[PDB]
Design a protein around this ligand. Sequence first.
Ligand SMILES: *[C@@H]1O[C@H](CO)[C@@H](O[C@@H]2O[C@H](CO)[C@@H](O)[C@H](O)[C@H]2NC(C)=O)[C@H](O)[C@H]1NC(C)=O
Ligand SMILES: *[C@@H]1O[C@H](CO)[C@@H](O[C@@H]2O[C@H](CO)[C@@H](O)[C@H](O)[C@H]2NC(C)=O)[C@H](O)[C@H]1NC(C)=O
Ligand SMILES: *[C@@H]1O[C@H](CO)[C@@H](O[C@@H]2O[C@H](CO)[C@@H](O)[C@H](O)[C@H]2NC(C)=O)[C@H](O)[C@H]1NC(C)=O
Ligand SMILES: *[C@@H]1O[C@H](CO)[C@@H](O)[C@H](O)[C@H]1NC(C)=O
Ligand SMILES: *[C@@H]1O[C@H](CO)[C@@H](O)[C@H](O)[C@H]1NC(C)=O
Lengths: 509, 120, 120, 209, 104, 207, 101, 109, 109
Amino acid sequence: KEALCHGLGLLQVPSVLSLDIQALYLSGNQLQSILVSPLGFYTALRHLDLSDNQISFLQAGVFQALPYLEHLNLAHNRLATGMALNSGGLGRLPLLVSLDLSGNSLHGNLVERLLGETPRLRTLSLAENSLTRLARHTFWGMPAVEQLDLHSNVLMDIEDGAFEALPHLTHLNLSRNSLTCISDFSLQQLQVLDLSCNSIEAFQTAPEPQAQFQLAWLDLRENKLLHFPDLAVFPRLIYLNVSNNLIQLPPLSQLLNLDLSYNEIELVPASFLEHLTSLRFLNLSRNCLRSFEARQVDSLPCLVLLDLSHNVLEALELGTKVLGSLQTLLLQDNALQELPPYTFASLASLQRLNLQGNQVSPCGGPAEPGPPGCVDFSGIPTLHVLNMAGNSMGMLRAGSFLHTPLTELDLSTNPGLDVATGALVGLEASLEVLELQGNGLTVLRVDLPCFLRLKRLNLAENQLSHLPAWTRAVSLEVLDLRNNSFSLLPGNAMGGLETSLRRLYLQGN
Amino acid sequence: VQLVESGGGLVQPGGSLRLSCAASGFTFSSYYMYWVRQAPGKGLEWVSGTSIGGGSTWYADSVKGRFTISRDNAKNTLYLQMNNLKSEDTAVYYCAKDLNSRSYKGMGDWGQGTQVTVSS
Amino acid sequence: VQLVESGGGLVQPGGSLRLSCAASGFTFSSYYMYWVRQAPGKGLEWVSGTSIGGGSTWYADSVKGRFTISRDNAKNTLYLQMNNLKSEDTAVYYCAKDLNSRSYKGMGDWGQGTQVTVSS
Amino acid sequence: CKTIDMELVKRKRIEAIRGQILSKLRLASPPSQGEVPPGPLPEAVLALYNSTRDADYYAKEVTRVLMVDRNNAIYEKTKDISHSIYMFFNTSDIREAVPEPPLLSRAELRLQRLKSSVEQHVELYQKYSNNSWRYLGNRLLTPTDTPEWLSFDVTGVVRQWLNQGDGIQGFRFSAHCSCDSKDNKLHVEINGISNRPFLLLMATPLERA
Amino acid sequence: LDTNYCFSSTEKNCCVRQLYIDFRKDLGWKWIHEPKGYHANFCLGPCPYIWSLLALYNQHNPGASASPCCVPQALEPLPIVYYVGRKPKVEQLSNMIVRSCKCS
Amino acid sequence: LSTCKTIDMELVKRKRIEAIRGQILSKLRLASPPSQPLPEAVLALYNSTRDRDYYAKEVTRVLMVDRNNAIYEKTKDISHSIYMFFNTSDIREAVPEPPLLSRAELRLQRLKSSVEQHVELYQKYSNNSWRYLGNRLLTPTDTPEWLSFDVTGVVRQWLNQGDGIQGFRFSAHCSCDSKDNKLHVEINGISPNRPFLLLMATPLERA
Amino acid sequence: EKNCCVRQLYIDFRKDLGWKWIHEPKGYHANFCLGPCPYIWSLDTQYSKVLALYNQHNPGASASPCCVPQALEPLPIVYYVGRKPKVEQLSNMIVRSCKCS
Amino acid sequence: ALTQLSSMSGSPGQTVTITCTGSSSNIGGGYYLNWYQQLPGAAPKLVIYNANNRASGVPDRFSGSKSGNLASLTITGLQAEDEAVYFCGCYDSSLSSVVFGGGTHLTVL
Amino acid sequence: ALTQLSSMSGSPGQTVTITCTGSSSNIGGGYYLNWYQQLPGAAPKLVIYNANNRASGVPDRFSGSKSGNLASLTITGLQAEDEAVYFCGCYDSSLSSVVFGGGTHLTVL
Ligand SMILES: *[C@@H]1O[C@H](CO)[C@@H](O[C@@H]2O[C@H](CO)[C@@H](O)[C@H](O)[C@H]2NC(C)=O)[C@H](O)[C@H]1NC(C)=O
Ligand SMILES: *[C@@H]1O[C@H](CO)[C@@H](O[C@@H]2O[C@H](CO)[C@@H](O)[C@H](O)[C@H]2NC(C)=O)[C@H](O)[C@H]1NC(C)=O
Ligand SMILES: *[C@@H]1O[C@H](CO)[C@@H](O[C@@H]2O[C@H](CO)[C@@H](O)[C@H](O)[C@H]2NC(C)=O)[C@H](O)[C@H]1NC(C)=O
Ligand SMILES: *[C@@H]1O[C@H](CO)[C@@H](O)[C@H](O)[C@H]1NC(C)=O
Ligand SMILES: *[C@@H]1O[C@H](CO)[C@@H](O)[C@H](O)[C@H]1NC(C)=O
């Protein structure tokens, strides 16, 4: 059986339950002090959940009366104002593998003389606390801890040797703190590190010959770094989230995730991409990039997503044998107005392309008067996600959308746009989704009943006085028309549409 | 020292006109400048005044707002922008220098004056 | 309510002495404190007076600075550290508290007095 | 570019505002609301809050002490002249508000005029020793169409009042007579004399001095 | 260098932005009876040096700070009404509302 | 993990030095250091400036109209005030146009005083009707002391008017209970160095 | 340290700038505000000792505290340009106080 | 300083008034005049506070009066328990101290 | 504004004085009072500035006077070339403008 007590309002540890319980849940109840009785009588409890209480006073040796305890949950308590008045600490804990001490408002000496000694303890929680500084002797009572949680604290200074007493530490959380300068990384065995939501201005590591470091995840989110951290010291790195920072950019081939969004990168060096050849993710949203110089050998050959959004990119230069594994490209409102027909005409394995709010135009063909210097979208078969907006051109070309299926087309902010080619010729077993909104469309020439694989259509805020009549099989479900003038609209001749309809939106009439 | 003027002629009531005062023989961008009009048969009357550089400009109370003065210190010319003329503006608008350089004290060397009228 | 006193004793001139006023029966942390002496055969003379918490201390000019007062609200005690005792300081010192709680009005209840003699 | 996101800065400030309000009040935790009486705030507390809406880091409590009422024997000795307005304050109530004079961070004397259609340069003094008066400050009064609240920094005056015995000490609201002119009368009417004037006592609370 | 300049339209440099901090829902506080919320009105800006560029740079100093920042100049205090025990306590907190801010 | 103790002081020292050089060149609307027994007049102006909106702003002094002038004899019968008249022509010579002027400071040297005298300041308006400018409570002292009154609006009004003689009044406080109080404070250069206006103006060359 | 205060930096126009155009003053005290003011994260239940760390690190809630000056003293200088010298006052050129944002 | 006559004598049962005069800052300054009686070999006790209000524990035979710069303590009648040296104590704005008078040796037959 | 007579006649060779009286804001304000002669069919010419000083190109025959609210210009010997309308001009600080007076047509013979 189990003994769960959450919010029962009892003012003391109950004694009605027998000596046969292994999980004593007393979290959330009204407990102000844990006496020895009756808890000292219990000796076979695997879980002591006393979190979210009013715990102020503990005698010396209350927890030592338990010889078979594994979990000590003391979170959201007041052990600061009650333990600093000469109250009994934890002392020696033989087999307690999981300790939770969060929200106890401890200072450096309070946490120093609270935890005592514990030979075996997997996790140590000191989050939501008030440690001003970390000393050498802070963790001298712990031989080997795996999980360390130091977040939501008021930490500023960590002196040298404050972590060398814990040589089996893998996870280390230092988020939501105030560490400022960080130097001389010498933990040598850390796996997981967090430095997010802090105020950190620098990160330098001594370049003297030392042992190998095995760090993988290193947030530097929402900090104030000025230079990019050195990664030649960290050859096992996988994750690096340096989003929302202030870095200027004036073996190593191991990174999988790398975020530089909301940073201060005016221009990325080519040598920076040259020395990093194992990337899988790269995020840059709302940066200050000038241009992406992806025109050198062995520069990001395994990249999957290249998020370059909300920048000013006057010229994009990508070519073959440089970066040909890109899967999704997220270009949003940077500067794109006129590009040579080689970036999107010869690169392979691209599926998603974004040209929202951009003046670039697709190329034509032998029988289409394409604008000079356009961008050719024909030459890759796997490009099926295409978004175009802001071209401000009224009659699209044919040939760029051919030789490949386009499962979705996004078109918006195109005044005077008229469609007669590409969306109806060369495509028969594709084009499931094709929506036009926020653009000036007057005459519709694309035959909706021609495509039998339609599932999601939208023709909102477009000036259409006619609508095509269905006479064949179709699987359309949604048809949205917002603020569209329609004096008359019969349905008897429109009978071929009613095959899978369940919700239609239309108003403005 | 001479101050020739331009921009006379008859103006329809409620209209607008501009007068220019080319200046020579002295450092134009060192003196205050004044516009003084005189209707035929009536005495002199102050119209407008400007500092050295046009930063601070002063106009008479009866003609405030309608007239606007400005300087072009490189070309040694100064302008008076008439707006919304009415029947008591029929006067010869004289352009005048100042006694000392950085001073607002009096009218020194005067101009020949040009005749500006408003009528039907 | 009572204010027992102590510290009475002969002092060689040029010396020092500290009294105490163990006050009970009233809220000591909410009453202004005073010291009053009178030479034998003479009248009462103000010695010193202090406020809640002892932050502001006020003295008679005859013992200004040369005597110091202090308060410790925790023990409900009152201290008066004299220095440099001489001829006219031979008096009996009276502890007193103001009749109203947060006020500098008067002296409500008095102690019993401690006799200090300076001349040796 | 030196650009950072909007939504992070708002939450970073809302949190720093949480910390700043909890640090100024010297509250290590939000106070318990179990011992809070029901119903709206008392009208005295509402009036005090309306009035206060109209190392100094930490928050100082606000206490309003009103002037001695006009129908008092202290006023029937100079209330015959018309060139000055006499305001007298009870120092016992001030000491009850601020029991320890070092805790008085700032003191503010406010005046309310009824309707002043004329410009008058007015003048404020302190009832000093003997019957002499000391300069405090002057404010030129432009004409108005609505009642207007004045403000005088009398922090040093109330500090000297707290460093003295409890009695009746007050101010003189006088018109400014130029030294080349005769004695002119005071033409501005103060409410509650001719919502009577009071004091704001920005005091460090004595429980966390 | 004031609230009216950047409360009417947006100017892309160091000036005040609207921020109404509610105590009931934005901060989750139940004890401050009045005011329910106030306009803390933070300010944020990309403010460069004067030679790389106004009323913002009236008190500007590049030789006194590591980098010029968007720091409040004029601050307006706030009063609050909250209970400690049974006594309703009214206190005024200085430097709550950012009315204007400068470059440094 | 070891938080570094202090930033290297010489690095931030040269960083601040270079930023100070940039600040000095930017205040003067300059971009290069200009090149070419300097007289005692600038010594007097500089020494007056030391004792007591971004860019550097020109400073220039204009002195009192001398006491022997026939403009003070009209009000010499008044013995409870000091009358300080300034030639507006010299002010306009220092500051050619109003809007570039930004701050005007009036200086008054007191040779020796031994009394609590509370003074005031006025200006003419040429009606012999005076506006209030600002008072100053003067304590007794054994050393010469200067004073400073904010007369920015005063000199702005004087520049918006014709060149002439407009001036100040240094009158003792005379409350309505004690009228015709004599001015017991002495100002150097009037009673048997002289007072002057200190003008903070934007230079004509740079703006 | 982590406290912002004025640092003594006496800057010389002759030896530290290599300038001959500035005549008086030969040099002046130009203190600089140094100190890394860190953003102090907040909790509902924190310690009474760390409530005193706001005053010297995050006095006003800034969302990015920084070491700006608080009290500024202008500097008058005289320099020889053209045939006539001119003395001119430089506003906010000496720092007296250093306050975290 | 507060001035009051040193010696005073009256028959038992006769109402006698003790007066001490101020200096326009002792009592004329609106401050608090308190009246204290001191029996021989005993501590002073509060009798009249604020110059006109009887204290607690005093019998209702003592009345106080304040008139300008003069403070009157009127003892209605005279019994065998009023043999005390009487003091008037009040603050002043001149010496910035609480000033007492030179006590009146009130006696009987 | 500036009170000045409208017509003033005379004969050659006398010494006649042209008056100019104001209201203590223009003449009594200490501002520069000027004296302009307007020859028939010509522009006004500066004669006497600040009511004391003689302008360039003007003979010493002209002299101005300045006293309180009264300022005047004197000519010792009238000739044919002096037959002109004379304006007194001074800045007015009441109207905040440089107001002129109504000129007098000085007729010789
Ligand atoms: C380090 O601690 C931070 C702070 O608690 C963790 O971040 C939070 O994680 C929880 C997980 O449930 C989320 O709900 C929160 O939204 C996170 N907040 C922020 C600001 O990130 C973080 O996950 C911890 N890191 C590790 C490795 O445990
Ligand atoms: C100033 O305040 C004090 C106390 O607040 C007033 O003293 C009271 O006066 C009345 C009237 O004589 C007595 O009945 C009370 O016993 C006194 N004490 C208290 C605590 O109320 C004093 O009267 C006030 N001043 C004026 C001029 O009214
Ligand atoms: C104010 O200054 C002006 C010019 O500095 C003085 O004008 C001079 O007055 C004298 C008096 O005889 C004339 O000789 C000069 O020709 C005038 N101009 C110049 C440029 O010197 C004016 O007198 C002064 N006002 C005073 C002294 O009250
Ligand atoms: C990096 O941190 C930002 C902070 O909001 C977050 O949005 C983003 O998802 C993180 N990166 C990854 C790969 O999760
Ligand atoms: C006379 O006084 C009024 C107001 O008192 C003022 O506006 C006017 O300017 C003064 N006269 C002159 C000539 O300045």
